[PDB]
Symmetry: C3
Subunit: 106 residues, 3 copies
């Protein structure tokens, strides 16, 4: 998927997590989020299609997705132990960071 489709997947799974009664299915959503972020590291925002793939802007892009991945890890480790809460709370900081990166590179 391209960049905006991956960001849409992230937002949709954040919504699934925030309204999750399915219990451990949060992990599934989190899983998808991870698979999105990693995939988005291979994409390029349209405004950076002219830059070099290793230019400082693209490096910042991929490293921001690394930050997202570490936050997703913080949520998923709590979800795996059996703590749906706190993971659902860190989903909000995840949404904040996702919106920040979206506004940054769109």
């Amino acid at each position: 998927a391209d960049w905006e489709d991956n960001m849409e997947t992230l937002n949709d799974n954040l919504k699934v997590i925030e309204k999750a009664d399915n219990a451990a299915q949060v992990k599934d959503a989190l899983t998808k989020m991870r698979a999105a972020a990693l995939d988005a590291k291979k994409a390029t925002p349209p405004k950076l299609e002219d830059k070099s793939p290793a230019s400082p802007e693209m490096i910042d892009f991929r490293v921001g997705f690394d930050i997202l991945l570490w936050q997703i890890h913080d949520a998923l480790c709590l979800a795996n132990e059996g703590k749906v809460k706190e993971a659902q709370a860190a989903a909000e900081q995840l949404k904040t960071t996702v919106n920040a990166h979206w506004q940054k590179y769109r």
Copy 2:
């Protein structure tokens, strides 16, 4: 070291995880796998020896090894909680991903 030797290490430690008896052996093998994957991130696979180190193909290669690293971390988080059988079930997905990378980049 060599990308092929790193793949050998990944396969050997997957075999170790498949026959592991406790959580310590699973954790040790997963740590060795993580080291091998981090080292292979700096390598160039045989299929991509005609591509620049910052080409999109090499970036996608490194992102694939990032995916492998996060799956390794999932297995390691399962092993830290004492869930050895869940860790081996995750090592199955690890083996699928490793075989896919081997077939893709050899």
Copy 3:
């Protein structure tokens, strides 16, 4: 510049961990360390300023930061399970790695 500031932040939080008592202090210092390491991964160290962004030196630099991040994660996992002294030993290993990277790329 900012990479140097991130290295100094890493060193300060390593000192904080070495002089810590409970797990919350170690966790907070390790979270600050993760933030600083991620922020420095997308920077250019002074030794590599004369190199192209597409050079393999920068790729190895970022991969070394990935290694440092995973060591930070191991320390944070030790701290999250109420293991303070083990987290401090892991943080001494982190100090070794951080000083290695700092004196290598400064």
